[PDB]
Design a protein around this ligand. Structure first.
Ligand SMILES: Cc1cc2nc3c(=O)[nH]c(=O)nc-3n(C[C@H](O)[C@H](O)[C@H](O)COP(=O)(O)OP(=O)(O)OC[C@H]3O[C@@H](n4cnc5c(N)ncnc54)[C@H](O)[C@@H]3O)c2cc1C
Length: 447
């Protein structure tokens, strides 16, 4: 069986891993149009902040290693087109220009996504950067120590934008974050959490300008100003982290796409065409909190879908179990994590929820290491099943969100979590830990 896998990032890499242990016998070709195999974009912040000194170590696989395992790795080779009926792909070697057609028995593609740009006047004056991949990581890092960069503007206040804003604020630059949305990180966290994080960011001279539409970049050769409908901001560097587009235009006419460019797949990762599977950022994934398919562009999702594509290679035998959307990140001293439905998700999906928020010290009063922690539990008003949770503290309590993710998947209720057995020891927590306490509050609210 000859299987071709497109993409060496999270979704394609795990399909190769699961092929190696489920079909050791197969002839496996792994294609990557880029120069570098399996660079970890998730580690870009640690590199920009100087935690990791070598950009080339921010990866999780090399072509050499995979070749030792019998995989044929083709870097700098792009799959240009798929001919699904005759089961062929045309590939182009980017260093020699040579094209060739390759046949396959099964094809698994994980084409990913590309940074969304603002097509506006000034569009590319110099020093308007993006944040995806090795080359952008290297260029961003050079700007961190450049004495000419004093003001950086990042457009977009989501996860990637706040990572870039933190990295340049720590490098000693003045940062403004501009977005049309009214709260930073709103997709991940509710208002009582983002109010705290906004104050923390402003304390580290990050100005957050929300509710502003960027109209044009101005400058002589290189950017000098970002002007919005409401204001103009000096900028020596702009990082655009507004969002991402699926890398699927080359597939229009070959595979069925959704109106937004996402590849249509079923629960076995199959596309509209026989023997081609699609995984990762370019697809929708079963979202268990709301029993629907949502696009959740996370490394965790692409890795699991990658393995489930191989499980269903010969037969639709293993439906995807679904995910909850779990994410976590540190923003200066605060470490937060969240899963399931929050305010922005409930609005988008049209879902009614109830919630309790507990803000108190997570250790008992006599313990000098006690610190405040915020926990919000979101549940279904009718069944009281758990729908989501968010937590934050300068102490790392994020591993507790892993239990809430399982609780949503298991359809547990606030009563189940109120009396769930979580260990107690006074150097670690209170007799009713952070999850029990919030669920105990929800039980009182529904009495
Ligand atoms: C700055 C940043 C931080 C992030 N942090 C986190 C995090 O902390 N945790 C988390 O879970 N997620 C995080 N993510 C998201 C995560 O990186 C993505 O969800 C994941 O990389 C998606 O994997 P993918 O395989 O679908 O696509 P991509 O990573 O987009 O990779 C697609 C690959 O396929 C290649 N390719 C595309 N088309 C072709 C072609 N036609 N021929 C040959 N090769 C091709 C591309 O070169 C690329 O290497 C972050 C993303 C960014 C940008």
């Amino acid at each position: 069986m000859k299987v071709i896998v497109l993409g060496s990032s999270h979704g394609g890499y795990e399909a190769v891993e699961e092929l190696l242990n489920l079909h050791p016998d197969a002839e496996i070709q792994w294609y990557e149009k880029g120069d570098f195999i399996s660079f970890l974009c998730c580690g870009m912040q640690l590199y920009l902040e100087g935690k990791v000194k070598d950009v080339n170590s921010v990866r999780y696989m090399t072509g050499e290693k995979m070749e030792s395992r019998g995989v044929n790795v083709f870097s700098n080779t792009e799959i240009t087109a798929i001919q699904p009926k005759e089961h062929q792909v045309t590939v182009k070697d980017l260093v020699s220009g040579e094209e060739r057609v390759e046949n396959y028995d099964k094809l698994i593609i994980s084409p990913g996504a590309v940074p969304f740009e603002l097509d506006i006047p000034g569009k590319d004056l110099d020093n308007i950067y993006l944040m995806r991949g090795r080359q952008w990581a290297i260029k961003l890092k050079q700007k961190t120590v450049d004495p000419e960069v004093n003001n950086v503007v990042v457009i977009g206040s989501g996860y990637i934008g706040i990572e870039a804003a933190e990295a340049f604020a720590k490098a000693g630059k003045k940062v403004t974050v501009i977005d049309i949305l009214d709260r930073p990180l709103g997709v991940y966290l509710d208002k009582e959490f983002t109010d705290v994080l906004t104050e923390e960011m402003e304390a580290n001279n990050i100005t957050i300008a929300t509710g502003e539409t960027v109209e044009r970049y101005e400058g002589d050769g290189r950017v000098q100003k970002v002007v919005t409908d409401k204001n103009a901001y000096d900028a020596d560097l702009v990082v655009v982290a507004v969002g991402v587009r699926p890398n699927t235009a080359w597939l229009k006419g070959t595979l069925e796409l959704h109106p937004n460019g996402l590849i249509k797949t079923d629960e076995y990762m199959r596309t509209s065409e026989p023997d081609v599977f699609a995984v990762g950022d370019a697809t929708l994934i079963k979202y268990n909190p709301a029993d629907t398919e949502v696009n959740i562009a996370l490394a965790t999702n692409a890795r699991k879908q990658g393995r489930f594509a191989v499980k269903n290679l010969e037969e639709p035998v293993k439906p995807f179990p679904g995910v909850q959307g779990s994410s976590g990140l540190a923003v200066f001293d605060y470490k937060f994590a969240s899963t399931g439905i929050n305010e922005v998700m409930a609005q988008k999906l049209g879902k009614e929820t109830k919630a309790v928020t507990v803000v108190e010290d997570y250790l008992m009063d006599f313990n000098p290491d006690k610190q405040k922690a915020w926990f919000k539990l979101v549940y279904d008003p009718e069944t009281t099943q758990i729908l989501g949770a968010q937590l934050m503290s300068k102490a790392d309590l994020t591993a507790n969100i892993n239990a809430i993710s399982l609780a949503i998947q298991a359809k547990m209720t606030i009563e189940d979590l109120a009396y769930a057995d979580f260990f107690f020891q006074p150097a670690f927590d209170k007799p009713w830990n952070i999850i029990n306490t919030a669920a105990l509050e929800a039980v009182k609210q529904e009495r």
